[PDB]
Every structure is written in structure tokens, then in C-alpha cells.
Amino acid sequence: MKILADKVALVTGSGSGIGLAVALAYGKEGAKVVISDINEQAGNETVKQIESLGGEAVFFKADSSSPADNEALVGYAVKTFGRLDIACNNAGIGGEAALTGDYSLDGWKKVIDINFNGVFYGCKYQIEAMERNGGGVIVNMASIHGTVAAPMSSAYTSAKHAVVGLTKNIGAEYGQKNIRCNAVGPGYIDTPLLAKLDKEHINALISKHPIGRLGKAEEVAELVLFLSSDKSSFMTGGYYLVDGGYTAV
Amino acid sequence: MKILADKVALVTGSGSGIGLAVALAYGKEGAKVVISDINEQAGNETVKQIESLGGEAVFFKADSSSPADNEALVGYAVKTFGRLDIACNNAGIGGEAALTGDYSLDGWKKVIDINFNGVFYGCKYQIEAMERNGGGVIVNMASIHGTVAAPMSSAYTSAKHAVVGLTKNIGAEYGQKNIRCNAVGPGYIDTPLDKEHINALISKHPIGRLGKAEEVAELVLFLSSDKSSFMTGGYYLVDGGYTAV
Amino acid sequence: MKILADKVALVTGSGSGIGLAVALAYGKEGAKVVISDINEQAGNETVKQIESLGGEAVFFKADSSSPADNEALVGYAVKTFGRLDIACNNAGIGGEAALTGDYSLDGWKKVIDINFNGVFYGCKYQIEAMERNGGGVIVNMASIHGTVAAPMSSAYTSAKHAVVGLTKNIGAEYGQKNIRCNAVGPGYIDTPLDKEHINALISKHPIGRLGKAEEVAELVLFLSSDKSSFMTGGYYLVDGGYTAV
Amino acid sequence: MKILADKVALVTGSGSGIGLAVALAYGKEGAKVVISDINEQAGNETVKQIESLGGEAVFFKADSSSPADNEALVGYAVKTFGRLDIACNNAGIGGEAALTGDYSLDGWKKVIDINFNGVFYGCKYQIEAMERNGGGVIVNMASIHGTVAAPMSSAYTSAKHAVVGLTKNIGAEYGQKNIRCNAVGPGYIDTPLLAKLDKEHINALISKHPIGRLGKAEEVAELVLFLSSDKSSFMTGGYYLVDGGYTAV
Ligand SMILES: NC(=O)c1ccc[n+]([C@@H]2O[C@H](COP(=O)([O-])OP(=O)(O)OC[C@H]3O[C@@H](n4cnc5c(N)ncnc54)[C@H](O)[C@@H]3O)[C@@H](O)[C@H]2O)c1
Ligand SMILES: NC(=O)c1ccc[n+]([C@@H]2O[C@H](COP(=O)([O-])OP(=O)(O)OC[C@H]3O[C@@H](n4cnc5c(N)ncnc54)[C@H](O)[C@@H]3O)[C@@H](O)[C@H]2O)c1
Ligand SMILES: NC(=O)c1ccc[n+]([C@@H]2O[C@H](COP(=O)([O-])OP(=O)(O)OC[C@H]3O[C@@H](n4cnc5c(N)ncnc54)[C@H](O)[C@@H]3O)[C@@H](O)[C@H]2O)c1
Ligand SMILES: NC(=O)c1ccc[n+]([C@@H]2O[C@H](COP(=O)([O-])OP(=O)(O)OC[C@H]3O[C@@H](n4cnc5c(N)ncnc54)[C@H](O)[C@@H]3O)[C@@H](O)[C@H]2O)c1
């Protein structure tokens, strides 16, 4: 049938951007989708788009940095659809731009709490549900900056590195428990947030991608979909680039 | 719809093991498939199975280590089907088992010729054809041993590292010429091959089992399709966690 | 001549284990050494040993996880010796042993605070001082678990990956400001810590033994010296081959 | 004493460049040094410089791509100084510049034979001598291009990747045989060959190094020296960058 038919999938930060594209891919492939976001209007709109494709979805408001919200979100998924098969830990921020020496303590803490700690809180409660329902598959949203530096964004690079480590650890630990965990590392993707950067800055970013363009959110979602499906059944603890060659040079 | 419908795909060493699984997946997804192998019977058998699923496939006998054979194989694909869209460089051998100091000069050269030089010969002629076609996609078959050692198989490990480097170079070079190149790194896979050695192998995979050729083929398919359009120059493990520890 | 003569060096967690070995090597090579630790007796003991070799050393009590303590430690170094040339961010803990699903919220936060956030707090204030001095060198203590998993220690593995990322960022950012930053990745090291578990650990190192803290310290020394002048943003294993397989 | 006192060290391609700098470092540190190169005049000059520092050295002409020359070179080292403790497999060429599709078959073969096969031939005969004399230490000269692409130099990138694999394999295999093997990955280094590139091309290279300059041969030699000494006794099968941050971004 459709490759995610009969599965229940959760996407954090699915109000916008990559998370939106992943939630739509999940919906189109027959998953029952739980949308989570800080922004309710964005989240409800994602639900409405999935429903308008003929999929099934619900919205639950949660801050990814809160342990209690992550626990509650998994609780809601299981209450609503009876199980949790697939989680995409996508919620994240870019953070302030400053050299490491000048990086604010609060700005640091915020990036680490959302982009790193929050991914762990998600995984922890997701794992608990997945163990109950016979296993599952987690996709953690990392970055190219999980492996290469992003000057002026030390907290982002550090957090995305930490997500790659966490992913390896979960994959290794739950190998024989039927839970797989993998990390996706996108290059620079054309979002609305990108339209806020200056055009000169955008050309420079483009020049760093051998493919000669920015990526699209749908192109990342294709990889997430794969890694979320049964097709990727021998793939766990891995890190998978979608970067137009950025890390190849 | 079939994700490779109307594509022309070539798989090297597609008479058995992973290459067979790749050719079958390509065939199932509607590609016209060129099977290449040093063993005609195996290759002919692969063609027959694709035909029995209702796909289209031809066999061309070739030694991967030979530049002329690679050029002739690609020439054959373009002549028979009008173009080349997809190539999987799969053909390889394990080589003799010896410590590096004891590795025979002839055994060394044979593994390098098939597993390293041959992948380059394939890619070179594949690229040439794809540029005439307006682009294409290559998947190179590496290994976990493209990133971690295989004691007693230094030639294999070296050649599989080389394939990763070559892949990065092609992906970076042809980014704006609409050719993508990626490498797949399988863990140990259950194929016709001592049970204590097998248990030692399984113990190295956190997933707790050896992989299946079909599991490898799924990743190759994804990487050969337009779904992977923003992926190039990358190395993609299918190893049940082997390299994560 | 002494390769660190007249340099001012700070080592975190230098009351025992690798940090002690690093501080001793720094002391032997003529640095003025600031010892930091949460345990005063251990720290005071380290100072005494450097003094008995004829080096110069002071102790400053600090919790690595605290931003104020890190700023005060660096302030202390600059006040006592006039400048900061070298820093080694070594302080870390192993954390509780649990599967990720079972990892306690408090245990998680403690490991992240010391091993990840604390290294950043150290680097931030160290960088500030070094820029006033016209440059400097940082060595961050990562692990093999900055690149491969440690089952039951997900917080440790995550934090050690973070340290590698931070190191890359600092090295890249301050390349033209004469500050270098590199990370060291030790394998399992013989320190005061079940013999079957120990044998399992040794079996994972191709060299066939656990490392010694002095072996780790030698690499840190090289990376702290002017001999490593073209090395920055790099991750450097000292692991008896652990990550090569 | 001097850190390589009483050791016998071999450097291939020590007539010029990095190999020259490594041979001088070895000599200054009290090693007995065997210089090998295709160019006799260059090689004899290196010997003369080592002797003028008060070191001991001899020259033996060998093509690194020949198994017989590598065997003979090790034979000469052992005949002359009684043993072989340290080998630096440095001989290498840059190769032609062409896209992979356009890369010549003969140009490919030549780069692979010198930069890769020749390193194996060296290691093989070095290992044989080192096993006889109770162990030793090999340093294989790789590149940044052992891990990242060099567009237009596919054979070089491929070969340098292969050297990293070979290194890991030797380190793993001989761990308990008292032979260590490690690979050095230099960024772009100021050689005379570099003066043959155009100045615009040189600025572009510089811009790719965060440190904001090209490297010096002496800076690579310092790392090789370390990895050749007893100080690096717990380091084997590793890959060690000297790249001014090139691979960090
Ligand atoms: N170029 C790129 O956009 C790029 C590249 C690599 C990686 N990524 C990663 O992709 C992920 C998605 O980013 P995006 O580009 O789609 O950004 P975006 O800002 O378009 O989408 C982020 C979404 O996350 C939500 N969110 C933010 N903080 C949250 C929190 N605490 N709890 C819940 N929801 C929260 C936002 O409201 C928003 O809907 C992030 O993890 C980012 O690091 C993006
Ligand atoms: N455990 C695994 O099986 C494993 C793991 C990692 C990577 N790989 C890689 O997967 C690829 C396929 O191997 P496999 O396991 O399916 O082995 P296999 O021996 O079953 O299949 C290899 C095929 O290649 C053919 N072949 C060999 N040399 C050839 C040449 N010179 N020219 C043309 N055809 C040639 C053989 O006849 C055979 O059909 C290889 O590149 C191998 O290195 C395999
Ligand atoms: N097998 C190994 O020992 C091994 C392997 C890889 C990496 N490492 C890393 O090496 C570093 C040193 O560890 P070790 O093996 O020497 O362990 P250790 O426990 O012997 O030494 C660590 C020291 O840090 C101090 N310390 C701990 N938390 C502190 C804090 N918050 N503030 C200040 N001081 C604090 C302790 O009192 C102790 O003196 C750590 O970062 C560890 O993660 C160790
Ligand atoms: N920017 C750089 O220069 C750079 C960067 C990274 C890696 N490397 C590597 O460093 C090594 C040394 O290169 P270099 O920059 O000093 O170049 P170079 O041309 O200055 O020195 C190379 C030396 O090797 C000798 N040689 C060449 N082929 C030989 C053969 N077949 N047998 C014996 N000797 C031979 C040459 O005669 C010469 O003396 C090479 O392996 C190169 O790939 C250099």
C-alpha cells in the first residue's frame, strides 16, 4: 500500500519549514500524524493541509525543550491513535550569530535546550512508547553542522554534533529491541527564514554547495521518509547527509 | 507509478549477491537494466528473473578491471536503449586473507584492479554517456571498510576507502552538470560465503543480525531515484550500527 | 630548552587522572600552571608534585559547570601570572549507567552541564583573555566517544560529540586571530576506576592494552606547543586503534 | 637525549619539500636517516644538509612505485645501519588536473601507482624489517584529500583515501606486534611547486584555510616527528590533520 500505512508518526516543529514538509510526506504515505509546535496557528494549518490531502492528523502544542511537554505529547499520540511508530525530532532554532568568545550565556543555553536537550527529552519518551508497542523508528534532525563548523554559530554546531552522538548511542543500545535511530544532516535549505538573510549572503551560501543551488524542504523530507520506513530496516545509528555536496569539499 | 520508469540502468557484478538484488529492484521499478558480470550463467539467470517479473534486461559480459570492457559496456547500454541514466558500480572481490606484510604482490594488484581502478573505469565512461544525455546518477558500492579496518584484508579496505574518495570528487565536480554520485557502505550481508567466525561477525553489528542484500538494494534504489535529488558526494551506511561503535 | 617556557597554562580537573598527567607535563616543560578541581586536596596535591619537580603551580577551586567559576578561574590566571597562553579543558564525569529511555533527567543534565556546557564556559573566558594577550592555544578533552557510541552513556557520548563540534567552530573562527583550538580523543585509560568488563574493554583496543594518562598528556603537550602551529579545529585520537575498527 | 637517538629512519621522496623537512627533523633528533628519491642530486644534497647539522645519513635511489626498489631500499637501510625503526612514506605526485570523466587512463594509473600502490610496497617491506627488529613506527603521508574532495584531482583524492584505509588496517593488524602506523593529512603547503600555480589560484587556496595562510613544510614535519617518536606510543591506525582548519568547515 502506501509505505507508512497503519503507522502513527510524530513531527516536532512541524508548523513550518522542514517539519512541515516531513509531516506532509508522512500524511501522504498514510501515516496518522501528530503535529507539535510552539505556534498553534501554524500547527493547525499543517493539520488542515494533511486533512485536505485525505490524511489523518491532530495538533498538540508543546515546547520541545520541556521534559513534561515531550512526555505529554507522546501520551497524547498514544491516547489518540493507540501507539507510536515513528518520531521525527525536528524542532530547532538557528541561534544568535557571534564568535564563541562573544557568545551569550543565555543564547547558548537556549540553543542547547531546544536543539539538543529537547531532542533527548523527545527520544526518551518516544522510546518508552515504542518499547511498549513492539519498537519503532526515530529520525533526529541534525545538520551539516553536525560534522563541520558554522562560524559564529558555535552553540548550533555543538548541539547538532551532540544530536549525532545521541543518535549513534540510541541505535547501538536498541539494536536488538527493534528501535532504529538515524540522523539527517541537511545543507542550506530554502525556507522563509532564509529570505531574511541578505542576497549577498545567500549567494555565498550557494557557492558553498557544489550542486549550485539551495535545497528544498521536500528534498529533505524524502530522506526522512526513507529512514522512517521499513525500507531502511538495516540502517541504524547512522548520519545521512542531504547537503548538495557541501561536506564533500 | 514506477519510480525509475523509462530510465536506463547498468549494474556491475549483477549476477549474484547485492548486485542481483540491486538489478531486481531496478527492474521492479521499471528501469531497462543492463546486467554485467564475469560469469555469463549467473548474469543470464539475473536477466531471466527480471524478465519473469515483466521488466526488461540484457546481459553484457565484462571484466570490471578492464577499461575497454567498461567503455564497451556503457556503449552497449546507449546503443541498446538510447541512453544511460543510472549506474551502480557493484562488482568486487574479497581478496586473499593475509596480514599486510604477507600480502602477495599479485593478490594485492588483483583486488586494487577490480575494486578501485575498475570503479573509476566504470564511472569515467558512465559520466561521458550521462553528459550526452543531460545528466544521470551513479551509486558506487563501497563498504563499512570504506571507513573502518578489515584485518587480513588491507587491499579491500584500501580500495573501499578509494571508492569513497572518488565518489566525493565526482559529486563535487559534476554538481552543476546534473550528475550525482553517492556511495553505499554495507555491513556484513547474508550471502553464500565457519559458524564461530559468523557469530563473531554478528556480534559486531548492534542490530544483532547480518543484513540482507534486499536491505542494501533499497538504499541503492533511493539513491538512484529523483527522490535523492539534493544528495551528492555522500557516503551512506547500511550496516546495522557496525560503524556507530 | 623547555618547550612551554614562560607560558601560562590552565588545566581543568587537574587533581587526578589525565588532567594530573597534563598539568605535570606542562609543569615539566616550564609553564606556570593553574590547577583547577572541585576537590581541593587532590588539586593541592597536584600543585605540590609540580613544585617538587621545580615547576610553578597554583590551585583554584572551581566547578567546571559554572560560568562564574570559569570566568573567575581565568581572571585568577591573568591576575597571578599576567596572562593566559594555554588552556586544557579536561574536567568531566562518566555519568550514570542507563539505557537512553531510562536515563534520569537530573543525571542527564549533570553530565551535559559539566562535560558540554562547562567546556564552552571555559573556552569563552579563555578566548577573551587570550585575545588581550595576542593569542593562545586551547586543547579540549573529548573522547573516542566524540565519534563512536558508548552504550549506557548517551549523555557522555552526546557531550563528547559536542566538544568536537565546539572545537571545530573555535578553530575556524579564530584562525586569523592567533588562537588555535584542537580536541583530543582518548581511548580507555588505566586509572583508578569488574575484571571481565576490563577484559572486554581491552579487547576493543587493537594495541591490546589500555592507555596510560602520560600517553594522553604527550599529545596534549604537542597540541599546546608552537610545534603544532598549523594545526587548528582538529580532532586527534589517542585510542590504541579503538576507532580504526 | 634527542628523541630519535639510536633509531634508523627512512624517508621516501626526501629530495625536496615535505620529505626534505621530515628528513632534516629526523636527522636533528639523532636518527640515522636513509634518504630515497628519484632525483639523485636532490637526494645527495639532503644527505649533505643532514651531515652539515652533524647527523648521519645515506642516499639510495628508488622509485616508490616499484616493489623491487622498495625491497632493495629496506635491504640497504638494514645493511647500512643494522635495523629499521621508522619509515615515512612521503613520495607522491599531484597528477593531472581534469574532471573525472576526462581523466586519462595513464595519468590515473601513474597517480595510483606512486601515491597508493607504492605506499603499500614500502609498508610491506618495512613491516618485514620492523618485525625482525622488534617493531617500529610507520607514518604514511596522506592529505586533506584523504577525507575531502579535490575537484579535478580524482586520482589524487582516491589514492590519499586509500592510504588512510591502508593505515587503519596496518594499525589494527599489528597492534600487538609493536608496529604502529598513522597517517598525516596536510593542507596546502608552501612548496616551490606551489610557486608554479598562478597568484589568483594561490589566494583562493589561502581563503580555504581559516588560519589565513599556507602551511610550511617544517610544520608538517613537526607532526610526523611526533608520530614517529615514542611520545605517540598509544596512537595507531589514526589520521592526523595539519591543515590550518581546512577540513573543519
Ligand atoms: N537551512 C535549513 O533550514 C536547515 C539546514 C540544516 C538543518 N536544519 C534543521 O532543520 C530543523 C527545522 O528547521 P527549519 O529550517 O524548518 O526552520 P523553521 O524556523 O522554518 O521551522 C522551525 C519550526 O520549529 C518550531 N519550533 C521552534 N522552537 C520550538 C520549540 N521549542 N518547541 C516546538 N516547536 C518549536 C517553530 O515554531 C517552527 O514551526 C531544525 O532542527 C534546523 O536546525 C535546517
Ligand atoms: N558482506 C557483504 O556481502 C558485503 C559487505 C560490504 C560490501 N560489499 C560489497 O558489495 C559488492 C557485491 O558483493 P557481494 O557480497 O554481492 O558478492 P558476490 O561475490 O556474491 O557478488 C559479486 C559479483 O561480482 C562478480 N564479479 C567479480 N569480479 C568481477 C569483475 N572483475 N568483473 C565483473 N563481474 C565481477 C561476481 O561474479 C559476482 O556475480 C562488492 O563490491 C562488495 O565489496 C559486500
Ligand atoms: N578512560 C578514560 O579515563 C578516558 C577516556 C576518554 C576520555 N576521558 C576524558 O578525560 C577527562 C579526564 O578524566 P579522567 O579519566 O582523568 O577522570 P578522573 O575522575 O580521574 O579525573 C577527573 C577530574 O575532574 C574533576 N572534576 C570532575 N567534575 C568537575 C567539575 N565539575 N569541576 C571541576 N573539576 C571537576 C575530578 O575531581 C577529577 O579530579 C574527562 O573529560 C574524561 O571524559 C577519559
Ligand atoms: N601542499 C602540499 O605540498 C601537500 C599537501 C598535502 C599532502 N602533500 C603530500 O606530501 C608529499 C610530498 O609532497 P611535496 O609537496 O613535498 O612535493 P615535492 O614535489 O616538493 O616533493 C616530492 C618529492 O618526491 C619525489 N618523488 C616523486 N615521485 C617519486 C617516486 N616515484 N619515487 C621516489 N621519489 C619520488 C620527487 O622527486 C620529490 O623529491 C606527497 O605525498 C604529497 O601528496 C603535499
Short mmCIF file of N, CA and C in Angstrom, two decimals, chain A residues 111-178:
data_model
loop_
_atom_site.label_atom_id
_atom_site.label_comp_id
_atom_site.label_asym_id
_atom_site.label_seq_id
_atom_site.Cartn_x
_atom_site.Cartn_y
_atom_site.Cartn_z
N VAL A 111 19.86 27.59 22.77
CA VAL A 111 20.13 26.74 21.63
C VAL A 111 20.34 25.30 22.12
N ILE A 112 21.10 25.12 23.19
CA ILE A 112 21.37 23.78 23.68
C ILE A 112 20.07 23.12 24.17
N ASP A 113 19.21 23.89 24.86
CA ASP A 113 18.00 23.34 25.45
C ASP A 113 17.00 22.91 24.40
N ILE A 114 16.86 23.67 23.30
CA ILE A 114 15.92 23.29 22.25
C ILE A 114 16.52 22.24 21.30
N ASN A 115 17.75 22.48 20.82
CA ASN A 115 18.32 21.74 19.70
C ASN A 115 18.96 20.44 20.17
N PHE A 116 19.28 20.35 21.46
CA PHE A 116 19.97 19.19 21.97
C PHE A 116 19.16 18.53 23.08
N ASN A 117 19.03 19.19 24.25
CA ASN A 117 18.33 18.60 25.39
C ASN A 117 16.91 18.16 25.00
N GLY A 118 16.23 19.01 24.23
CA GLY A 118 14.87 18.74 23.82
C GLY A 118 14.77 17.48 22.96
N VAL A 119 15.79 17.25 22.11
CA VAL A 119 15.85 16.06 21.28
C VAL A 119 15.98 14.83 22.18
N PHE A 120 16.78 14.92 23.23
CA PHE A 120 16.89 13.82 24.18
C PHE A 120 15.55 13.57 24.90
N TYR A 121 14.87 14.63 25.36
CA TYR A 121 13.61 14.50 26.09
C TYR A 121 12.57 13.81 25.20
N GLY A 122 12.47 14.25 23.94
CA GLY A 122 11.68 13.58 22.93
C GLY A 122 12.02 12.08 22.83
N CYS A 123 13.28 11.79 22.52
CA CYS A 123 13.71 10.41 22.33
C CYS A 123 13.35 9.55 23.54
N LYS A 124 13.61 10.07 24.74
CA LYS A 124 13.36 9.32 25.98
C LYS A 124 11.91 8.85 26.04
N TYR A 125 10.95 9.76 25.82
CA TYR A 125 9.54 9.41 25.97
C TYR A 125 9.05 8.65 24.75
N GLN A 126 9.62 8.94 23.57
CA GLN A 126 9.31 8.18 22.37
C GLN A 126 9.71 6.71 22.55
N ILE A 127 10.93 6.49 23.02
CA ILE A 127 11.45 5.15 23.26
C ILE A 127 10.50 4.36 24.18
N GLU A 128 10.04 5.01 25.25
CA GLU A 128 9.15 4.37 26.21
C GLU A 128 7.89 3.85 25.51
N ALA A 129 7.29 4.68 24.64
CA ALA A 129 6.10 4.26 23.92
C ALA A 129 6.42 3.17 22.91
N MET A 130 7.49 3.37 22.14
CA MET A 130 7.91 2.40 21.15
C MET A 130 8.23 1.04 21.77
N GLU A 131 8.90 1.01 22.93
CA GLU A 131 9.14 -0.27 23.58
C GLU A 131 7.80 -0.97 23.90
N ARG A 132 6.81 -0.21 24.37
CA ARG A 132 5.51 -0.78 24.68
C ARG A 132 4.87 -1.39 23.43
N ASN A 133 5.01 -0.73 22.26
CA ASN A 133 4.29 -1.17 21.08
C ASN A 133 5.20 -1.87 20.09
N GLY A 134 6.25 -2.52 20.57
CA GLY A 134 6.97 -3.52 19.81
C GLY A 134 8.09 -2.93 18.96
N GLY A 135 8.42 -1.66 19.18
CA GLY A 135 9.51 -0.99 18.51
C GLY A 135 9.06 0.22 17.70
N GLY A 136 10.00 0.78 16.94
CA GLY A 136 9.72 1.97 16.17
C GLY A 136 11.02 2.53 15.57
N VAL A 137 10.90 3.73 15.01
CA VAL A 137 11.95 4.34 14.24
C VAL A 137 11.97 5.83 14.58
N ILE A 138 13.15 6.34 14.96
CA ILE A 138 13.34 7.75 15.26
C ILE A 138 14.27 8.32 14.18
N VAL A 139 13.91 9.51 13.68
CA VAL A 139 14.78 10.33 12.86
C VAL A 139 15.06 11.63 13.60
N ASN A 140 16.33 11.88 13.92
CA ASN A 140 16.73 13.12 14.57
C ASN A 140 17.25 14.09 13.50
N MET A 141 16.73 15.32 13.51
CA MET A 141 17.14 16.32 12.54
C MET A 141 18.44 16.96 13.02
N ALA A 142 19.54 16.62 12.34
CA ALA A 142 20.80 17.26 12.65
C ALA A 142 21.04 18.36 11.61
N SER A 143 22.23 18.38 11.02
CA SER A 143 22.66 19.40 10.08
C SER A 143 23.99 18.96 9.49
N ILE A 144 24.42 19.62 8.40
CA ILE A 144 25.81 19.60 8.01
C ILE A 144 26.67 19.99 9.19
N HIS A 145 26.13 20.86 10.08
CA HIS A 145 26.87 21.38 11.22
C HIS A 145 26.96 20.40 12.36
N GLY A 146 26.38 19.20 12.16
CA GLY A 146 26.74 18.03 12.93
C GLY A 146 28.12 17.47 12.62
N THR A 147 28.77 17.93 11.54
CA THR A 147 30.08 17.40 11.22
C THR A 147 31.07 18.51 10.85
N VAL A 148 30.61 19.68 10.35
CA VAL A 148 31.51 20.78 10.01
C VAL A 148 31.05 22.05 10.74
N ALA A 149 31.99 22.95 11.01
CA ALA A 149 31.73 24.20 11.70
C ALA A 149 30.84 25.14 10.90
N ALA A 150 30.12 25.96 11.67
CA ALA A 150 29.35 27.09 11.18
C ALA A 150 29.86 28.32 11.93
N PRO A 151 30.89 29.03 11.42
CA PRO A 151 31.47 30.17 12.15
C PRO A 151 30.38 31.14 12.58
N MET A 152 30.46 31.56 13.86
CA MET A 152 29.51 32.46 14.52
C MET A 152 28.29 31.72 15.07
N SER A 153 28.22 30.41 14.88
CA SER A 153 27.11 29.64 15.44
C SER A 153 27.63 28.44 16.22
N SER A 154 28.52 28.67 17.19
CA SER A 154 29.09 27.58 17.97
C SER A 154 28.05 26.76 18.73
N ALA A 155 27.00 27.39 19.28
CA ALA A 155 26.02 26.60 20.02
C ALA A 155 25.26 25.66 19.09
N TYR A 156 24.91 26.16 17.91
CA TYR A 156 24.22 25.36 16.91
C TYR A 156 25.09 24.14 16.51
N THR A 157 26.35 24.39 16.11
CA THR A 157 27.28 23.33 15.71
C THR A 157 27.42 22.32 16.84
N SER A 158 27.66 22.80 18.07
CA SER A 158 27.82 21.93 19.23
C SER A 158 26.57 21.03 19.44
N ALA A 159 25.38 21.66 19.41
CA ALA A 159 24.15 20.93 19.63
C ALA A 159 23.92 19.87 18.54
N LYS A 160 24.19 20.22 17.28
CA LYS A 160 23.95 19.31 16.16
C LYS A 160 24.94 18.14 16.18
N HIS A 161 26.18 18.42 16.59
CA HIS A 161 27.14 17.37 16.89
C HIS A 161 26.60 16.42 17.96
N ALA A 162 26.09 17.00 19.06
CA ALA A 162 25.53 16.22 20.16
C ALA A 162 24.34 15.34 19.74
N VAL A 163 23.51 15.83 18.83
CA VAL A 163 22.42 15.03 18.26
C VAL A 163 22.94 13.80 17.49
N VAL A 164 24.04 13.98 16.75
CA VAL A 164 24.66 12.85 16.05
C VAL A 164 25.14 11.80 17.07
N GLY A 165 25.82 12.22 18.16
CA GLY A 165 26.25 11.29 19.20
C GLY A 165 25.08 10.54 19.84
N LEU A 166 24.02 11.29 20.20
CA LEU A 166 22.84 10.72 20.82
C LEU A 166 22.27 9.65 19.88
N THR A 167 22.20 9.97 18.59
CA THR A 167 21.65 9.06 17.59
C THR A 167 22.45 7.76 17.56
N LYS A 168 23.78 7.87 17.54
CA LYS A 168 24.60 6.68 17.48
C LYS A 168 24.32 5.80 18.71
N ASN A 169 24.23 6.45 19.88
CA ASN A 169 24.02 5.77 21.15
C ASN A 169 22.69 5.02 21.18
N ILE A 170 21.61 5.65 20.75
CA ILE A 170 20.30 5.02 20.71
C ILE A 170 20.34 3.85 19.74
N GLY A 171 20.88 4.07 18.52
CA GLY A 171 20.98 2.99 17.53
C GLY A 171 21.72 1.76 18.07
N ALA A 172 22.85 2.00 18.74
CA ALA A 172 23.64 0.92 19.31
C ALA A 172 22.91 0.22 20.46
N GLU A 173 22.28 0.99 21.34
CA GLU A 173 21.64 0.46 22.55
C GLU A 173 20.41 -0.36 22.22
N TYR A 174 19.59 0.08 21.24
CA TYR A 174 18.29 -0.54 20.98
C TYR A 174 18.27 -1.43 19.73
N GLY A 175 19.45 -1.74 19.21
CA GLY A 175 19.62 -2.58 18.03
C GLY A 175 18.79 -3.86 18.08
N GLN A 176 18.79 -4.52 19.24
CA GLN A 176 18.08 -5.78 19.37
C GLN A 176 16.75 -5.56 20.09
N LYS A 177 16.30 -4.31 20.20
CA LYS A 177 15.00 -4.01 20.77
C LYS A 177 14.04 -3.48 19.72
N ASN A 178 14.39 -3.59 18.45
CA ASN A 178 13.54 -3.19 17.34
C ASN A 178 13.22 -1.69 17.35
#
